[PDB]
Amino acid sequence: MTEYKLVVVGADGVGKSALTIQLIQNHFVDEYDPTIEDSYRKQVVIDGETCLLDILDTAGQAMRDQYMRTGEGFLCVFAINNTKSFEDIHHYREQIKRVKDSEDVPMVLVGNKSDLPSRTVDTKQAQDLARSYGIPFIETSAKTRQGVDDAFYTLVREIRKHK
Numbered sequence: 001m002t003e004y005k006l007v008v009v010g011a012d013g014v015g016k017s018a019l020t021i022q023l024i025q026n027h028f029v030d031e032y033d034p035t036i037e038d039s040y041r042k043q044v045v046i047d048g049e050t051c052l053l054d055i056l057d058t059a060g061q062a063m064r065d066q067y068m069r070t071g072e073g074f075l076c077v078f079a080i081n082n083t084k085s086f087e088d089i090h091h092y093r094e095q096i097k098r099v100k101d102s103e104d105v106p107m108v109l110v111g112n113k114s115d116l117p118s119r120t121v122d123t124k125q126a127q128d129l130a131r132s133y134g135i136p137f138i139e140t141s142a143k144t145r146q147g148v149d150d151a152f153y154t155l156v157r158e159i160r161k162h163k
């Protein structure tokens with residue numbers, strides 16, 4: 001069984017933990033409990049093959065150089081109602097390029113909080129940014145579970161291609 005080390009990164013509050021907990025536990029955390037560093041594991045079938053997901057949920061607010069070196073793929077999460085978090089994607093992208101010394105690191109752009117009525121980043125904006133970096137884009141809601149499996153499964157597919 002192939003293991004995949006996945007890292008969830010993004011600004012403080014975009015929903016990194018809520019997305020990961022939805023994937024693992026199938027429920028929505030309404031609380032705001034800032035993360036230091038948590039890991040989760042889940043066995044899944046993706047495209048007919050069992051995969052072990054070893055997922056690191058990171059702080060948005062240390063081990064960063066180390067987890068970027070170890071991580072095989074990155075979910076780069078922003079919130080669709082927070083423009084600052086969208087612009088922060090450039091910073092996370094640049095760091096990952098730096099630590100890994102490559103321009104083709106498996107990544108997926110995730111626009112979370114799609115259920116909220118305060119949208120400030122339209123789908124075209126996000127699709128343009130993802131196209132500019134050569135990565136897929138997935139809209140998610142940790143509240144309704146929209147796109148959660150698809151976001152993580154798409155990242156695994158990007159890792160599979162890279163190997």
Ligand SMILES: Nc1nc2c(ncn2[C@@H]2O[C@H](COP(=O)(O)OP(=O)(O)CP(=O)(O)O)[C@@H](O)[C@H]2O)c(=O)[nH]1
Nearest residue numbers: 012013014015016017018030034035060113141142
């Ligand atoms: N409506 C809605 N709320 C969400 C969604 N995702 C997260 N939230 C809410 O946003 C807040 C922050 O979510 P959380 O998962 O803690 O964000 P985080 O990026 O891990 C915060 P940190 O970087 O400090 O660990 C929580 O109150 C959570 O319920 C979503 O898809 N929809």
Ligand SMILES: O=C1N[C@H](c2c([C@H]3CCCN3)[nH]c3ccccc23)c2ccccc21
Nearest residue numbers: 005006007039054055056063066067070071
């Ligand atoms: O070299 C490191 N291995 C750690 C690790 C884990 C752990 C959790 C329980 C089993 N593997 N799963 C991961 C997923 C993505 C990236 C890093 C990890 C880690 C954590 C933090 C910093 C460096 C490192």
Ligand SMILES: [Mg+2]
Nearest residue numbers: 016017034035
């Ligand atoms: Mg968190």
